[PDB]
Design a protein around this nucleic acid. Structure first.
Ligand SMILES: [Mg+2]
Ligand SMILES: [Mg+2]
Ligand SMILES: [Mg+2]
Ligand SMILES: [Mg+2]
Ligand SMILES: [Mg+2]
Ligand SMILES: [Mg+2]
Ligand SMILES: [Mg+2]
Ligand SMILES: [Mg+2]
Ligand SMILES: [Mg+2]
Ligand SMILES: [Mg+2]
Ligand SMILES: [Mg+2]
Ligand SMILES: [Mg+2]
Ligand SMILES: [Mg+2]
Ligand SMILES: [Mg+2]
Ligand SMILES: [Mg+2]
Ligand SMILES: [Mg+2]
Ligand SMILES: [Mg+2]
Ligand SMILES: [Mg+2]
Ligand SMILES: [Mg+2]
Ligand SMILES: [Mg+2]
Ligand SMILES: [Mg+2]
Ligand SMILES: [Mg+2]
Ligand SMILES: [Mg+2]
Ligand SMILES: [Mg+2]
Lengths: 55, 185, 141, 54
RNA sequence: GCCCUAUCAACUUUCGAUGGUAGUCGCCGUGCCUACCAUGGUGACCACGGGUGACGGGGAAUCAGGGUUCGAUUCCGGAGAGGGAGCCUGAGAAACGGCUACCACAUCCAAGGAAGGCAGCAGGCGCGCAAAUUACCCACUCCCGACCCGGGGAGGUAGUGACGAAAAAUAACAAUACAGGACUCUUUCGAGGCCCUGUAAUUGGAAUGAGUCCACUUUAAAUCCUUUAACGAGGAUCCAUUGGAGGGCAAGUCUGGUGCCAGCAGCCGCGGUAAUUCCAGCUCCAAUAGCGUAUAUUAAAGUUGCUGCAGUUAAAAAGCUCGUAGUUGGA
């Protein structure tokens, strides 16, 4: 309807964002990505998960 | 009616299919290995190799004793030998087709800084060449995309060091009048 | 082809030169009265003046009331149903203002669930709407 | 260049360079107040051109 | 040697249309124009008439080969200075930063009268989705003159400038605090290392500019860059955003709210009381000083098909023969 405007954003739960260390950029980000792919870890067992797979 | 140039040209080809899974790997090992800062330097090298190959694949289209092929293929092999990829014993225009990407990355000066043992790591290289610590043949060098003059040379020419003695005052000359004379004495 | 002679050029070219006119993307873009009857007139943006705030139902499986703004344009004087993209950003639009309308993106064609609404809203009163929505900017009071 | 003669300097040397060492005074009025002096000296014909300027 | 149209198929001609003769004008050749005679000239091989968001050509972007689309815009060649006609000086102009009149727009006035033209550089008004300093100088390249010597908003140098294009910061290391491995082992675990990868906001004194800026230098006068002295950073707070995380298409069945409501989504699709797609946290991705959203457009399109398409039922061959142009024609 036109009389329910702004219901959910108006009525969510506002939580302040966090405050942490900055992320390295430039080549140093690319280097950390290189560091978490090939040279140190092995395929351990079974399938391969995703890098965000908190399950 | 002005007197200018008006001439520029791009030197990187974005690919055609964007999200192949296998290309981002090989094009990540070619970053983590030679210590690069983005993907444009990769696309820029592959396009300079494509320019070399496609001209060669135009000359091999030509019969033997072509007066064009004689002059062009022979001065091409001069332009690759003096940047020192092909073996000078191998002046033969069939070995161009077997030429990968690493034939230029190994000749980058950032690796010849790592391999000549005049550094510590590879990522210490770009910080050297940033901080005006080297030269080549009495000419100071500031750039890691400077494959030049395969007959090469080392550092330094002339640079007087004083970064921290000409830093904090010997760690001696600071405590004369700071909280000492105006307090107890 | 069907005729294959050596001097049959004015037959081929005066056959292709007719049968090109039965294309749809050639006839709409090239000569014809589509550029004539474009409300923009062959351009990518247009300013307008709001006159009313209305809502439009949605089509099938869906059940909602999307939000639209009746706009009269400057350079012609025609009337357009726009669209308010984000959540609740109808409450920042007051009557008789100026909005900067951009085409939606399916080249003047109905999209998604919304029946017959071509155009959307980008800027309001020379204040960008992503900043008015986020909070980087503020309406000029 | 040559070292030949002091007097060939002013003969075959441009006057912006003599004033590096310093031998040449330049003008002190710009070109905007010269063009308006010139055109205001163009309206009138007669002796009084010298009478209207500065 | 050229763009679209047959819902333009017949045109021109005592209003010179096509030709013959003698003249006039004009720099010369001719219906260019008068005087007298003849009745002819173009056209389905597309004349005539109408449109063009048409200035033309050198060329630009994508492309296998073929081609499509763009060329207002710095070089050559023509046209025009509000609109249209007229003419002087002059070798050369129907000139407009030269004059004479009309129409439209327009200034100062003592009300008798006078004068004007930015589609020259700057700068305002306007119209717009839509585009910069009312700055400095003849030194460079060159042009004009009576001329070595005076001039030139042509031109040059600066200011604005994320159209775009090139190169390129935001960290580097060492000691032992934790894991992982070929290498020596030890029945495994440990350990032992000719070589470690590293992982923590762990600790150490390293190596520099961005900036600050004296002094040259540069330049006609200055500035930037360039060279250098002093200065100048450890959460080095001198701090990287834009989009996204069902599939196509890289990447969360993490947690808390609403409960077919508000909304996302280019396409399929999500939401009705446990939503991996909504508003937010945490985490994760792709590009990186750049990235998305519109529109015009080319390739992909053998979905305009000459190379290279279809026509029984899906869109598709006139109801049937004859027939002038056309196209193709045996040995
Ligand atoms: Mg991919
Ligand atoms: Mg054919
Ligand atoms: Mg639909
Ligand atoms: Mg032209
Ligand atoms: Mg083709
Ligand atoms: Mg085409
Ligand atoms: Mg010309
Ligand atoms: Mg006249
Ligand atoms: Mg004229
Ligand atoms: Mg004038
Ligand atoms: Mg006027
Ligand atoms: Mg003009
Ligand atoms: Mg002069
Ligand atoms: Mg000029
Ligand atoms: Mg700049
Ligand atoms: Mg400099
Ligand atoms: Mg998206
Ligand atoms: Mg998200
Ligand atoms: Mg996507
Ligand atoms: Mg297209
Ligand atoms: Mg088909
Ligand atoms: Mg049918
Ligand atoms: Mg039938
Ligand atoms: Mg029938």
């Amino acid at each position: 309807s036109l009389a329910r405007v702004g219901k959910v954003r108006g009525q969510t739960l506002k939580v302040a964002k966090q405050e942490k260390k900055k992320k390295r950029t430039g080549r140093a980000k690319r280097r950390m990505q290189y560091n978490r792919r090939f040279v140190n870890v092995v395929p351990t067992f079974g399938k391969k998960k995703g890098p965000n797979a908190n399950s | 009616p002005v007197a200018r140039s008006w001439v520029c040209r791009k030197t990187y080809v974005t690919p055609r299919r964007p999200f192949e899974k296998s290309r981002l790997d090989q094009e990540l090992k070619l970053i983590g290995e030679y210590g690069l800062r983005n993907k444009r330097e990769v696309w820029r090298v592959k396009f300079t190799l494509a320019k070399i190959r496609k001209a060669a694949r135009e000359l091999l289209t030509l019969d033997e004793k072509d007066p064009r092929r004689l002059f062009e293929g022979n001065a091409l092999l001069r332009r690759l030998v003096r940047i020192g990829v092909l073996d000078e014993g191998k002046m033969k225009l069939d070995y161009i087709l077997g030429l990968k990407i690493e034939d230029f990355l190994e000749r980058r000066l950032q690796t010849q800084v790592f391999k000549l043992g005049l550094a510590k790591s590879i990522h210490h290289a770009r910080v050297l060449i940033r901080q005006r610590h080297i030269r080549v043949r009495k000419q100071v060098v500031n750039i890691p995309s400077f494959i030049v003059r395969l007959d090469s040379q080392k550092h330094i020419d002339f640079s007087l060091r004083s970064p921290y003695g000409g830093g904090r005052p010997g760690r001696v000359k600071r405590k004369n009048a700071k909280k000492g004379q105006g307090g107890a004495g | 082809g069907k005729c294959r002679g050596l001097r049959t050029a004015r037959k081929l070219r005066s056959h292709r030169r007719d049968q090109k006119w039965h294309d749809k993307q050639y006839k709409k873009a090239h000569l014809g009265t589509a550029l004539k009857a474009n409300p923009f007139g062959g351009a990518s943006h247009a300013k307008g003046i709001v006159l009313e705030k209305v809502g439009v139902e949605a089509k099938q499986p869906n059940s909602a009331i999307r939000k639209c703004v009746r706009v009269q344009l400057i350079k012609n004087g025609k009337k357009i149903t726009a669209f308010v993209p984000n959540d609740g950003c109808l409450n920042f639009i007051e009557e008789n203002d100026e909005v900067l309308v951009a085409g939606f993106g399916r080249k003047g064609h109905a999209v998604g669930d919304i029946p017959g609404v071509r155009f959307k809203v980008v800027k309001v009163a020379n204040v960008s709407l992503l900043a008015l929505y986020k909070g980087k900017k503020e309406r000029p009071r | 260049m040559i070292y030949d003669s002091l007097d060939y300097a002013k003969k075959n040397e441009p006057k912006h360079r003599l004033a590096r060492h310093g031998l040449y005074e330049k003008k002190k009025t710009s070109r905007k107040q010269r063009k308006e002096r010139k055109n205001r000296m163009k309206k009138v014909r007669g002796t009084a051109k010298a009478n209207v300027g500065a």
